[PDB]
Amino acid sequence: KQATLFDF
Amino acid sequence: KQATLFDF
Amino acid sequence: KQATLFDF
Amino acid sequence: PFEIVFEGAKEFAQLIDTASKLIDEAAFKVTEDGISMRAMDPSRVVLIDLNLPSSIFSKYEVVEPETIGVNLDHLKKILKRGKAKDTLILKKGEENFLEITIQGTATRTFRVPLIDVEPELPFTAKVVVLGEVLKDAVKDASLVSDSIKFIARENEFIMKAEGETQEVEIKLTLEDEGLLDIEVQEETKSAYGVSYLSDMVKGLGKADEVTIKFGNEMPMQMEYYIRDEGRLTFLLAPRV
Amino acid sequence: PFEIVFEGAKEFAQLIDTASKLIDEAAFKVTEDGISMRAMDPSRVVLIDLNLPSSIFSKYEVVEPETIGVNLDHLKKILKRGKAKDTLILKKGEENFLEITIQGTATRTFRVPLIDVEPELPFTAKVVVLGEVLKDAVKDASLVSDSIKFIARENEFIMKAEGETQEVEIKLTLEDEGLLDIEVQEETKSAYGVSYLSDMVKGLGKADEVTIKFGNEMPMQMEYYIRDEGRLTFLLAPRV
Amino acid sequence: PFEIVFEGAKEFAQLIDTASKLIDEAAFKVTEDGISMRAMDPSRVVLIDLNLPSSIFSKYEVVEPETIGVNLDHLKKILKRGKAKDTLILKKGEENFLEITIQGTATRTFRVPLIDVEPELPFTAKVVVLGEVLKDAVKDASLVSDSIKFIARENEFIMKAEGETQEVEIKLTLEDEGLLDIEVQEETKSAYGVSYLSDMVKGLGKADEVTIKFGNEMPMQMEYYIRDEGRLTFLLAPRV
Lengths: 8, 8, 8, 240, 240, 240
Hints:
- By secondary structure, chain A is largely without helices or strands.
- Helix content of chain A is 0%, strand content 0%.
- Chain A has no helix or strand.
- Chain A is elongated.
- β9 of chain E pairs antiparallel with β13 of chain F, so a sheet runs across the interface.
- It is classed as dna binding protein.
């Protein structure tokens, strides 16, 4: 899945 | 307004 | 008419 | 009847392409002194005047002068593959046809049926500018309006436009390599339609030296030369 | 199995792009002497024959010869970014896949699944012309017709066309730098379809030296070479 | 208020065009040390960070620092006709307007209304590549997938992708003129979205030296410099 920058 | 060449 | 290569 | 030869087909095609932008068809008058064409655009706002003297042609013979109708769009397509160094020949006999030959790597001749096609102004300002300046100035103006105002003073040529929000001002002085000459008799102001200018400058060349004359709320005359002796002139009614 | 390397990916892509214009997929036969491909277009009017001898490749090894099916459109896309100096590698092992590597600034290799793809003429005329002449002659003709007539005599090659009104004649003689050679056994005449020629000459290069052979109301053979030893040949049925 | 002058309008426009691909509008912070901009794309997958120090400008004066909202699309159009050697001026007074002047053959100034616009990563790999490599690698990958995997080891940078059938592998080592530098702390692997990279590398230049940093299933940082001191940095979330 395409992660969001919000995950890092 | 856009004049016509007819005006000159 | 357009001939076909099949004609030669 | 006549046989006329112009060296540089591509350049002749561009001259014709510039004219086709405003008009669709025109009557070309061929006389012993040169070729001339004059027409108004469909809306009667722009007049185009073209004059090509015999000295610009490598061969120029007119047995009997005559006028011929030409569809610029059709001519345009025919000259489209003429190259920069190709030779161009326009020949007409007694019949109602035009023979167009483009001679370079090969000799290509088209036979096209011909169809009939049926007041000095006191300009108070004159400037000579690089075609690139008009081409860029018109696109700049189009970004903010459908109208552009021309303002000329001593050593100062200004074109400006403003829309609902943004505005743009293109200014030149002699120090700019874009302004080649300026001769003003008095502060001159007039406005014009961006679309018309866009069509007028479209075929214009980046390095072509364009001359412009106008008066207060008066039409603008725009011309540039072909092989020095030739001339293409636009006359555009103002947006008073 | 085999590993074949051609130096000049861009040039190989263009050869393939020329072929894709008439055909969609073709069977390439790889043997120890070179690669060869032969196919007819969907309508059965044009045959394309390509032959690329081993001497044209920097590396050429064929353990066991074989035929492979190729979709030209797919191959075309893959070779699209090959540059003029990029190295191109075609490698196949036992599996039913083709490995295409484009090597230049980086080494890029594609793995594409392979799919199976299932009479000398007495030409009386031969001319060698610059690709630019055919490309321009076909567009000229298209402006007036869907048919173009080829006429050859001693020191005279003529292609002409005429529609409801206008006509166009493209003529060459040895004096023209467009005609590189002419060998005629007798006045030869035949006509062809403009669309087909348009597709045939589309991928053609401006300076490529093209050879053309034909006979009276007979098909026309059009070929040009690749690294001298390679050859792409078109055989086009006439419009009798 | 401030007056900032950058020599090379075209180059500044391209920097702005690269940014507009991911974002539509952004807040530019002007301080005495330089201009900086930071924004995330609509989907929250890519962050763009731009920094332009004063040393890159021929003139740089900031009386009082401030932030201004800018629509990249609108700015883009205005800078579109700036030439390679044109001078670019960004001037703002007390009013809420931005004055953009493009000075070359003529002096063109636009007045545009301004609108308000409202964690170090442990990268285990770094490579410097020619922009052409990324641009080609992304298009190659797009031909087979919407995902591309980045693999870095000592003296080996690999980008690969595979779809329902075909696959593509772009590999570089120091011997390749496409790989300018490689520093890996351990075998690093991560995957990314082709579309995002396509937008990120679109404005990228063929010969630009691009630096890339990433970690295992971690985002990728992509940057390239402007007049050495300037910097445009992309931060792209991974496809874990």
